[PDB]
Each structure stands twice: as structure tokens, then as C-alpha cells.
A paper describes a structure:
Gram-negative species couple polymerization with translocation across the periplasm and outer membrane and the master regulator of the system is the tyrosine autokinase, Wzc. The tyrosine autokinase domain forms the cytoplasm region, while the periplasmic region contains small folded motifs and helical bundles. Autophosphorylation of the tyrosine-rich C-terminus of Wzc results in disassembly of the octamer into multiply phosphorylated monomers. We propose that the cycling between phosphorylated monomer and dephosphorylated octamer regulates glycan polymerization and translocation.
Previous work showed that mutation of K540 in the Walker box abrogated Wzc phosphorylation. In contrast to phosphorylated and enzymatically-dephosphorylated protein, purified non-phosphorylated WzcK540M was homogeneous, oligomeric (based on molecular mass in gel filtration) and yielded discrete octameric particles in negatively-stained EM images. A cryo-EM structure of WzcK540M at 2.85 Å resolution was determined with C1 symmetry. However, C8 symmetry breaks down for part of the periplasmic region, so local C1 refinement was used to complete the structure. In contrast to motifs 1 and 2, motif 3 (268–402) is not well ordered in the C8-averaged map and working in C1 identified three discrete structural arrangements. We designate the three possible arrangements as class i, ii and iii. In the most common particle, class i is found in three monomers (chains A, D and F) with all motif 3 residues visualised; this permits an almost complete model of the Wzc monomer. Class i is a four coiled-coil helical bundle (α8–α11), composed of two helical pairs (α8–α11 and α9–α10). Only a portion of α8 and α11 could be traced in class ii (chains B, C, G and H), where the helical axes are arranged approximately parallel to the eightfold axis. We were unable to identify any density for motif 3 in chain E (class iii).
Numbering used by the authors:
A (entry chain E): 17 to 64, 85 to 261, 406 to 477, 494 to 721
B (entry chain F): 17 to 64, 85 to 297, 304 to 477, 494 to 721
C (entry chain G): 17 to 64, 85 to 279, 385 to 477, 494 to 721
Write the structure that this text describes.
Amino acid sequence: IDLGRVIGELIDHRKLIISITSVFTLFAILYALLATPIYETDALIQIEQSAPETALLQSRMILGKTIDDLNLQIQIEQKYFPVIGRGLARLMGEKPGNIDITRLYLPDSDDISNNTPSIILTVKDKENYSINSDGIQLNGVVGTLLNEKGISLLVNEIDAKPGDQFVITQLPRLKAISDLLKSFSVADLGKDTGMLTLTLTGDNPKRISHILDSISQNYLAQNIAIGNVRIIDNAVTDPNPVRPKKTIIIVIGVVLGLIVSVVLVLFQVFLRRGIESPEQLEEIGINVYASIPISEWDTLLAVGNPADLAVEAIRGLRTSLHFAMMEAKNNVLMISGASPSAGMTFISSNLAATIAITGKKVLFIDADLRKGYAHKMFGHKNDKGLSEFLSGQAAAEMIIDKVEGGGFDYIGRGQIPPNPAELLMHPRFEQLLNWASQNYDLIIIDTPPILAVTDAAIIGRYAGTCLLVARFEKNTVKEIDVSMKRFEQSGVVVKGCILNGVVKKASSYYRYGHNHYGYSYYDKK
Amino acid sequence: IDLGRVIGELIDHRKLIISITSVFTLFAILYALLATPIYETDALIQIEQSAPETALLQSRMILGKTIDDLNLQIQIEQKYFPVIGRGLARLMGEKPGNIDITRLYLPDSDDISNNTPSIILTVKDKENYSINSDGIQLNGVVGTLLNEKGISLLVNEIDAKPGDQFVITQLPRLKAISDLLKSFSVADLGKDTGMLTLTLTGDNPKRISHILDSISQNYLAQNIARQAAQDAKSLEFLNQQLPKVRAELDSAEDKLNAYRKLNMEAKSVLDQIVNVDNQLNELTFREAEVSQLYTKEHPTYKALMEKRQTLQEEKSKLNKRVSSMPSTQQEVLRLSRDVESGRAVYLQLLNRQQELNIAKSSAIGNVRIIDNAVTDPNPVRPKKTIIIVIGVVLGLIVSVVLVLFQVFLRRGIESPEQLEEIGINVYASIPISEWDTLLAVGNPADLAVEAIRGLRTSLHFAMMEAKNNVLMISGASPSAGMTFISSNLAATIAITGKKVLFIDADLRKGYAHKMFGHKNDKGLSEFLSGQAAAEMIIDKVEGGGFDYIGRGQIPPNPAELLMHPRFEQLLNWASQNYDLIIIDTPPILAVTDAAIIGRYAGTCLLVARFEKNTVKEIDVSMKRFEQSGVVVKGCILNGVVKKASSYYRYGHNHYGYSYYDKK
Amino acid sequence: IDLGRVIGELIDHRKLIISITSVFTLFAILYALLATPIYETDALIQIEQSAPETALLQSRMILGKTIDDLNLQIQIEQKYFPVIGRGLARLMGEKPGNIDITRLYLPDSDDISNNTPSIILTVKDKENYSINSDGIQLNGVVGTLLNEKGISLLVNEIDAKPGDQFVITQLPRLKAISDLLKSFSVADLGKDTGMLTLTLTGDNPKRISHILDSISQNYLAQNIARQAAQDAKSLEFLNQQLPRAVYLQLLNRQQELNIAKSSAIGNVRIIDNAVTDPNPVRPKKTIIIVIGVVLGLIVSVVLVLFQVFLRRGIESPEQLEEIGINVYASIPISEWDTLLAVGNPADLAVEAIRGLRTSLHFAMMEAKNNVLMISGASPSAGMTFISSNLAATIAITGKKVLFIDADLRKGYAHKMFGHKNDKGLSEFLSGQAAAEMIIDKVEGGGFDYIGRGQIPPNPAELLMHPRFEQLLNWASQNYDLIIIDTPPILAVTDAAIIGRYAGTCLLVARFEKNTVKEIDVSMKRFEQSGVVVKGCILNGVVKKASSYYRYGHNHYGYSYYDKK
């Protein structure tokens, strides 16, 4: 692999790379916007040490006293149904509602697992509200305390709009202490100075500053009730959130999308075996006679769009065949796919059309007695196709039908017989070929793939020329070689191959200095 | 790839390299010349340790005093419309105008995000000015304070030319402290030494030294008041006053609760008066401290009573506004004023007690300011020289990687050597002519015409021992110069006294008829489709000497017209009247017409384009011709350009010398 | 590459190498002898610490007191127009004049263009002088102060010659402190020890020692003042506390504090006062010259290496013979309108052409006819020099030689031999001249020549006329050898047309200018047109040691005569 191969592969998969990278960046931006901003407050404390002050500041004594003072065991969360509701609600601009609760006793359900009782409060106005723990509806009022259903609850100053729901949890005191301890940090900036820097993170900037001030003053009061701790700086909140770090999140999104795109591209590059250029077949010693491009398009393409790029390639194939087919036993050309859906009847029918327009009589036999659909494609008197002639119940003149937008006669397969391979072994097939080799200038035979069924091997003994049809990416070089060796093993010589369905690729161009797709050539008018 | 290869590539792509490098250095130069200069000031403080003092100097407590005295919450920015207007105005010598604001209080929106209210002040003269917060136009005069629409402002000593605009922000005290702290630095410099090296950076050299002087003197006066605080009565005074103020606050809170158990203008004037009361109380305490540690005739004390008189006038106006509003909201406003002023005084006295307690128990005695703050007039940023150097180096690296990519990603033919390696005979390398008449006729002394004459002499030797005198010339891709080559070759072989017929068998995009002047009726199409004879389709080129057959009208079936026996009849007839027939044919990788025609031509030549075709393309064309029974004699490389990379990779550039007597 | 190759390359390029190194060294000596010498003074301070005293010495307080004492805000520079006038004036022995200014007050415009005001003082005699700020001339005298135009100046002791100019700048005190601090350096020789080394650099050896003594004395006075301030504060408190045993005790304490206050000498000791080192510390001339020499050598070697690796021209006949191109001669450079073979028959290039003639006699037998077409690869390859001199050397041997100049585009053999320029080869080809009107006699020659004639508009198509072949067939029986001169084949096609009629064809390759691939391309382009080039003549060979060490031979040839 070289630089040109790498860049060509990247250019080919530029849609996949761009899509995957943009999906990753979209997810990163969606996270950075919808992630709740977590703020930071800090306070400065002077010690006259600082090793035991840290362990006493984070003790459950100070922290629990702070929680008791500020009633931090009453958790209130405005209710948004998804994991994205809070973020987008902040993004639009709706101010998040808060209700001040000072006295809360839930019935202490204290079941096997859920140690934290929780209710949902629904705001009905600025004045009254409703409560539902487990569907039990209660109606309450700001001011007047509520003592009903094992519920004691005191709301002051509801600040929200009606319809808002709030999950209100009475979490245990140690859970609250652990929650405070998780976001509270004590450090010493100088490592030798008496100063301690207290830090608290949280989503509500005012609440965390109040909490850190309370921590500072609880520590101060504990010391005084003596070695003079003094509060240098009270807690103030940085208004810029410290998390989420939007820029690094987006950058990691972009970089990770690039890495995933690149690794998928290399997996696809090293895991594809199909044909990529005619050079791959010509290395094996196989003569490629045309590389037919993809046509973006029941009429024949060589008729509904004679100026199409694929029809031009097929004309090139016709001129190759006029030279390859001389010094052949007869005017019979057997076209065989390598695999099903190799685009082989497309090629044979359009080749019949382009050879017919040159003033030659062409007969298109559809000897795919298993899945042949030429009759469907050309319109049809479906009775008396090839099977009926082979099984003895038709004459040669009764099975030939003329294509309207054609110029070539054709013979349909007929009814799908139960024994397609054994009808073709009848001498009537060779009699039909010998008869048609006098009334027609060219006979093109449609055959099933040789790696599926043996029918093509039987038919190809009576064919002067035999051409395989490969699909551009679907068929492998080894499939073509296996097909030609299986033809040889049965006494049939494949003259060469027709690569079909070629698409424009930069990897081809850089790997093999030609892409093999072909130029468009007309004066635009 | 060797040294000569790389040198040749650099020489060839010198234009791209120079342009990219010059663009990068231009960007670096304009950045270094337009970025705002950042000056640095430094002081030297002597300490009688010093790590607690380094951490206490950078505390919000010490810095907040500097924001309070120097009004650092009033941000004034001279308004330049672009991101570069300030720098280019500095370059043109326009002195940055400045205005002095001693009192600014905005309507204090406090929305979700914009915590910093902003207004725009336009200068009209040396005396009056205009203001527009949110489109509301106001007219103010320096001196006389302005109280309008919940906006209090006092602008003094305006020193800008008329028409100058300024963005005035009242950024919050904590934001002011953060901005100050981000640019402030304190270092002991010895670890034992009492020597503290304070530094401060900023874009105004006169202002940062005032800030650093304020910081140094704040810390100095703090440590001095530490010595006199031990015996001072202020401690006991605060210890007695704080319970009284707390009791008054509790009484006010109880009264507010009893009365409770939202007019826009009422709340706005309440906020105005609360702010005025905070400023007045803080100014009273600052006046006391200054009168203790400074003199009355000191300029600071003069600023103090001037600001006090200003605040008193503002409070009087606010009280007059209150007296005009109905008593129903007046009662609520008075209760709110009492509660908020009690809270403010309680907080201020708590801060006073905190500062006094911190001052008292400081082990450090005499502190002395050795070097007052002085600003280095050479900006510390931008570092112009390194900026321009990085610009040059970055431009060079970018140019080198672009050139390396374009060298490793190119596949087009670089010399006839590439073709002749594959066993393809090149018969001429036609150069690019900088120049509707034929080049071989308009400029018979051209360089490309000389190459084409060489091609003529090479063809006379190639075309001997051929089947006939028919020469088919086919491109490899469109726009390979195939018709240029064939037409000028007909022009050169014509002047040698030979009868040349130029058939244009490109029935798809043939334009030789337009290029030679057209009796376009009865072209090759009409003859092929049977509606014309040979004698009526041959025309004569005026500046030529060779006859030509045009394509005619574009048929719907060019490849099927060309297979007619009429084409071979025409060629067999013309091969007896003419010494040479040259046929213009479409490319073989586009259509198959050339493959059909080449069966009737005794010699066939492909025209490759210099950089636009690949060697693999030429080989694919020759093999596609061979597969149809046409044998391509060789190739004509076309459009060659002079390249040093050819001269170092191969020994020859294949471009060709110019040879005439210069006159 | 090997040792022999690089040695030969340096030997060949010795002129470039020596010239580049010489230019670099002249730059080095010019810089070393014109850069202003910088002297360094040193003083020794001992502390009985050492970390804060270093920062105190370099503080704006001590330095500012020094500048106020010595008036360092007045900067005086002798005026020389170039960046080299001062250096050359020092070289010529001109003692630098100085003026002593004790009081200066400039108008202090302090505008954006000029922050520090400046005037120019022109010395007219030992006493009087003139001043111009921005063109306004004012006359002053030593002694009598000048107070005019918002300018006050007191100049004392002018020591200079008349016509000397001095740029006098008034520096802001902070700028003077910045300048002083830049050159002043405090160090601790022990890194812990109380010993402090003070150094100061500058272009005036006496001034820097005065400044460093001022700094040291200000620092010492400040240090002893600190001990005296505490002692005087204690004494002042005792005196203010004076109201009988306590009275006598306080009197004794007052006397003790007086004696301790006056005994100032304390923490700082000035061991060495500043003295200037007479040898300037900068510019370090010898190392500068060494760097200049080495840099010139490196630059020369790099340029030589680039020229060696980027040259593609022919360097020996063996390069051509590697492909299989027969080289029949290598013609050296002749150091030299008459022919070389006639003006200087004993030249080295003419001897090489004689060797070529004897080689050609063998090469040209079994050829179709006696026609020899000589073509170049490039113009200016020496085609006509070789052709004409070869014709001369073959004509002195008593053979009929016809020299045809078939270069119809830039042929100048007629201008070389002297010309009856009418009826050249073009005129014969154009149909308007006979064969016999175009042949002319070379005067100092011995061979006939046919000039090209008037430059035709179609040189390549005239040569295609059968008249040309008729002329060759006719001349092939009236002459023993026809030498035809053509344009180069990589320029035009005329040589390929003419080579159809020549029995022998030879390419002339210029020694350094042409490339081996160029000669191969030329021969293959000849073959493609049915013309077989017998071989090559390398021309313009020069003597090179790189060839002698790379190849076993230089291919330039010996001179061979008996010197008398």
C-alpha cells in the first residue's frame, strides 16, 4: 500500500467517513449542550498543620452539621421525562423552577432496597399544589403545613409555573453527607502556607456557595469551641461552568469519529475480494473484452438510451467480438454469468440490439431454463419457448418471436421444466442451433452460471464462442478462474470475460493508472 | 526520490511555494502589527514566610479593595467596528481616547446569561455626550450627573474627539476581581527573602501601574493597621455594634413578614437607593480609614468627599422620585429598603470584623514598598519577531507538504521516457504554444510547429512500408490536442508539395469545419448516410493547401454510419487522388469509432496529453485498439511544458530549444 | 562518492571556496574592528542572606539614586553618519571627544514620534558651541547658561575639535534606570557566600567605573542607614521619654544609642571598588574571526556539494561511452576572424582536431559517399568551430574539401570566413542560383565553402528540395570530402532531413552544457528519421581534478612541443 492507494480509498469512502464523523460530532455537540452545567465555588481559609484540618473538614461532623443546618437531606429535582429534557429546557431559555421546602417527613417506607422515599409534587398555581407518592393524591397550600397519610410537608414560596412536576426525595443523612463529600474538596495551594482552598461543585451556583459558606462557618465554630482559624475569602461561585468542557468534548468527538471512520475504511479495504479492475483478470491470463459501466437507468437500454455510456461500452464490445469471433466454428456466441445477478442478460440483450442495428440478423436464445426472464423483458407470447421445443412439443418456427424495439429474433425459455439440464442434452438443441446458424448472422445464447448449474457447460459445446460476464465488485477473480477451469474441464473454451457494472473509483486510478470507467463524449447539443 | 528530484520539484512549484509562504508571513505580520500590545508593570515589596503573603495578595479580599477604590467594575472600551480597527487605528497614530467615569449604575438586567449590562456612549463634544443602552437615546453633560430610566452616570474629563463611541460595561465585582487576578502575579523570588516581586499586565500602561500601586498600598496599609489594631478601640466597637445591627435586621425582617402575611418602577428605584446606600456606607468606612492613615489634602480624600457629594445628590434625587409615587407602594418600598439596607450593613460590618481579625493576628511587622509600580514601555506581547518567524516557518512547511502531496499523487505523463518504457514509440513531443487560423500558418516559426515538422519527418519514415497512405490520429482522452496535431500536421505536410486530405471522422464533437471555415452542408455524415457524394463533401482550406472533409451534422448513430461500406469506398477513392489522408477520430476510451476507422488506415497514432493522460491510459488505449485488430504505430506526446524536475529526474526536459537569428 | 571524488571537487572549486571564505572573513574582521569595544568594570561586596541584597542592588531605588547623582539621564553621543564611522575613527587613532553637561532641560515635547527630546550640539571652538533641535540654531558659550526657546543647557569643558557633533538626548529617568539595569549585573561567586560580584559594561571605561562606585556607595549608605534608622528611632524615643537614678540610666542609654548610631559600618562591606578591565570584553575579536572562517568554509562546502549533486552535464567521454556512443574526439577549450587551425596551427584544440581527422579517415571508409554531416545537440555546442577547423586540417593534407553551411537559420560561417554573401545555399535551393555561383574560396583556408545565404522563411522545406541532393551528388565527384553544418536536432528537423544524404553523421556534444540523456535523445531522434549517427565529438573539454580522481583520466590532453 502507498500514499495514492490510501488517499484514493479515503476519497472513495468520503461519504461514509463524512457521515460517521458528522454523527460523532453531532453526538458530542448534543452532549456538550444537553449536559447539565456544573459550577464551582471556592473559599480561602487560613491555618496557623493543614494536614488534620483537611481530615476534619471532610469529616461527617462538619458536613453533617452543614446538612442539618441547610436541610440538605431534602432533595428537589424539577421533573423532565427524558435524559435530554433538562438540557434542552435550559437551552431554549425556560428558567428552571424551584420550590423552597423546609420541613419534610416521608413515611420512611424503608423497604428491601429503596431506602430513599420520594414523591412527585405538581404545581397548580403560585399558591397551591398537589402531591402523589404512589398515586395517593393530596392537595396542599404554601404556608399551611400538611400532615396527612403519614406525610408531613411544608412548602414556602413556590417559584414556578403551573404544570411543573418536581421529584422530592427524603434521602438518608449519610447519603446526603456522602453526596456533599463527593463534590467537596480541600486543598493547600502553597503546600507550606497556612492557606486552605475549599472547593464545592454543583449545578446550582447559589446553593453551592451557601453550602460552602456553611461548611466554612461550621469549621470555624467547631474550632472556636482556641487556635484561630480565619475565613479569608468567603465562598463565591465561578459563573463559567467547569463541566461540561465543551471544546474538548467536541474535539474528542471529531477525533473519535475520524478514527472510527478510518478503521472501518481499512477493514472494508482489507476485507473485500471482488474484482476492482480488468487488470486483476488480465493478470490471470483472462482476456477482458469490455468493462461495461453502471447505467443509472421494459425497453432495452440500447434502444431507450442509445447514447448511454454503457451502450457505448457495449458497442466497443461488439467491435471486439467482430474480431474475436472470426475463425470460430460457427456464429453461435454463448454468454454465461459467473454468478447469478452478474448483469449477464443485460449484456447479452443489449449486445444483440447493437449488433442488430448494424444490419445483421441476430437470434437471442434464452437457454436459462431455470430463471430466464428474457420473455418478460421483451414482451411475450410465453407459450412455445425453448423448453417446449426441447421436450418435443414445438417446431423451430413456432418458438421464435420478434422484438419490437429490437431488430433481433429471440427464443424464450418456455415453462420452467423439471429437468433443465437433461432437456439441453437432447439432440433437438443441436438441431436448432445448426438450423439457426444458417438463417441468422449471429446467435447469442443466454445461459445460467456455471458455478450454479452445469447447463452452460452442456450448451457451450455447440457454441463457437463463449464469454463470461463478471460483476464489477460482486465477483472475485478466483470465481472467474474457477468458472473458466470448470468450462475447460467439460470441453468448453471461454474466449474471455466481460467485466460488468464498473463504477468510477479513485482507488483504481491511483493503484492502476486508469480507472477503466470510460469518458462521456458528445457536444452537449 | 533523490536530491535533484526534490530540487526540481521545488523549482517547478516555486510559484505555489512562494505564494503560500508569503501569505502566511503576511498573516503573521498583520497579526504582530495589529494585535493589542500588552504592557507589564512591576513593584518590589519588602517583608520583615511570604508564602502566606503571596496567597493573601492574590485573595479576593485584597484585590476587591483595589476594584473598589479604582472603580475597576466600570469597563470602558473605545469602539472600533472590526476585529482589526483598534490595531490599525493605533498604527495610524490616532491616540486612543479615554473617558473617566466616577459613578456608573446600569438598570441591572440580570437576565439568564448577560450578567454584565452594557451601554454605548457617543462623544459629541468636549462637554456633552449621548448614551444608548438598548436604543433609548439620552443626552448627558460632563459634570452634572445623569439619573434617567434607572441609569445613573457621571462622566468627567472626557478626552476623545467627536464621534468616538465607547462600550461601557458594569461588570460584576467578582468578574472584575477575576480579571485582575488573571493578570496579576506575586513572587517572593528568594524563598526566604522578604522581597516580593509584584507584576501586572494590561493593555493600558498608565492604568496597570495605578492598579499595582493601589494593590501595593492596600497591602501596606493593611499590615500597618495591623500594628495599631492591637490597641485600637475598633475591635470592641464592632463587637458591640454588630449585635445591635443584627437585632435591627431581625426586627426589620419580622416587620416585613408581618406586613407580607411588584411595580417595575418601584423595584427599580428601590434597587437604585439600595446601591446608593451600599456605596455611601462603603465610602464612609473608606473615608474613616483614609483620614486615619492619610491626610485630608491628599488627592484620594478629595476624590472621597467629591464622590460622597455625588452620592448624596443621587440619593436626594431618588428620594424626590419616591415622594412622587403613591403611598401604597411607598410603604412596601420603605420596608424593602429597611430590610435590604439592614442586610447590606450586616454584611459590610461582618466583612469589617473579618478584615480586622485577619489584620490583628499577622506575625509580620514592618512592610516597606521598595519600588513603586513602573510600567516597562516595551510591550511583553505580542512578541513580533517570533510571531513572524513562526509565520515564515509555517508557510514553508505547508508549502512543502502541498508540494510533496502533488508530487506523490500525480500520475500523468512527465516525459516520453515513461511511454517508451512500456514499449510505446513516441514520434514527437509537441510543446505548448502560448497562442482560428492554423498555428502552422499564423506562426510558421513557432516552436510547436517546429516539433510538428520533426513529426512530419519521423512520419515519412514510419509511414513507409504501410498498407496505404491513410493516417488515423486518435486521442487517448478528449482534449488531448488530437485535432490541433492533425490539422497542423496536414498544414506542414501540405507545404512540401503533397496533396493532403484531412477527413474529420469525429462525428460526435468534430469542429474542424468551424476551424477551417465551413460549407458544413454535405459533411462526412451526409456522405455516409448516402445523401451526398465524395466530390461535394471535399472543401479546401484557405490558409492550408490540403483539402478537408468535415463531420457534417452530428448523426444519432456515428459508430453505425462509420461501419458503412461507403467509408471504405471514400478511403479507397481518396487514396488514389491524394498523397496522404489524415483522419480525425474520437478517443478509444470514449467510443469505438476510432477502432472501426483504424481497420482502414495504414498507420495509426495516438495523441497523448502531457500531464492530463496517464501511461496506463495510453497502454489501455493501445490494447483496446489491438483487441479490435488495429495496430497503433506509436504515440505523439502533446502539450509538453518546461520542468526542472524532468531535467533532474531524466537528463532532458524534452521541451526543445528555440532556434532563430533573433532578427 | 569517495575520498578521491571529494578531493577533486574541492580542488576544482578552490576558487569559489577561497572567494567565499575570503568574503566571510573580511566581513568578520570588519565587524571585529568596527564594532564598538565594550569594557567591563567589577566591584566586590561582602555580606556578613545575599538573596535579597541582589534584588535590592538592582532596584529602581538604588539605580535611580545613582542616575540622579551622576546625571545619567543626559546621554551624549559623538555623531558619525554611518554604522561604521565610530569604528573607523577609532582605527585612525582619532581620540573620541567628549563634552561635560551638568544641567539640561529640553522642551519635552514627548510626542508619539519622539518620546525623548533630542538636540544636536556642534563644537565650533574650545569655548563656544551651537545647538539645533529641529533646525533652529542657537549659539552658546561654556559657562554662561543657555535659556532660550524652552531649552536650558549648561555645557562645561568641551574637549573636542571644531566641527564635532554630539547627539544630546534627555532620557526619562525610568529609561535611564532601564539602561543602567540592562548592563549592571550582580552575582554571587559562592552561590551561598556573602561575597557579591558587581559588574557593569559600557563603551566608556571611566564612566562605568564611576557609575559602579556610585551604585556601591549608594547601596552601602542605604545599608548603614537602616542600622542607623533603628538606632536613631530608639534614641529619639528615649529622648522624648526623658522626664534621679532613672535620669542617669536614661542618659547612659542615650549615650549608648548615640555611639551605636554613629558607628554605622554594618552588614555590607565594599572590598574592591570598581576598576575597569583595560581589555574590552566585547567584541571578542579572535573567536569572531574563527567563527567567520569556519562559517565561510561550511557555506563554501555546502554550495560546492549542491553544485556537484545538481550538475547533469557531460563530464567525461566515458559517460557517453557507457551507453555505447562512439566518441571520436574530445576537443579542449582553446584559450583563443581567421580559423584556429590557421592562426594557431600548434594549438591544443587543433591537435585534438587532427586526432579527430585521423579517426574520421578510419570511420568514414565503407560509407556510402564522402559526405560528412555534423550536427549538434544544443546550440552553442561548437559545431561550426569543429566543422571549419576539421575542414582546414583535412584541406592542408592536400584533399579537396567542400564545407557547406546548411544551418539556414543561424549559420555564420560566411561572416567568419569573409563573404561574397550573395548566392548562398538558400539561393541555390530557392531556385535562383546555380551550383557554381555559391562555392567560394577560403583565403587562409584551402577548402571551398558554401554559405547559407539569405535566411529563408522555410529552411526545413528548402532542404527537402531535390536541388539539395543534386548539389550533394554533383559535389561528391568534384571533392574528396563534403562537411555539412546543420542546426541542432533537438531544436529543428533540418539535420534529420540532411542526414538522409550524408554517408557519415557526427554529433558535437558540448562538454559541460549538454547532458548524456540529451545526446541519447538526439541520436534516437536521428534514428527515428532513418539517419544513423556514427558517433560523437565531445567539445570544450576543460581540465578537472574531479575527473582525474573519479575516472582514471582527465581527457584534456598534453601539450607537446620542444619549448624552443
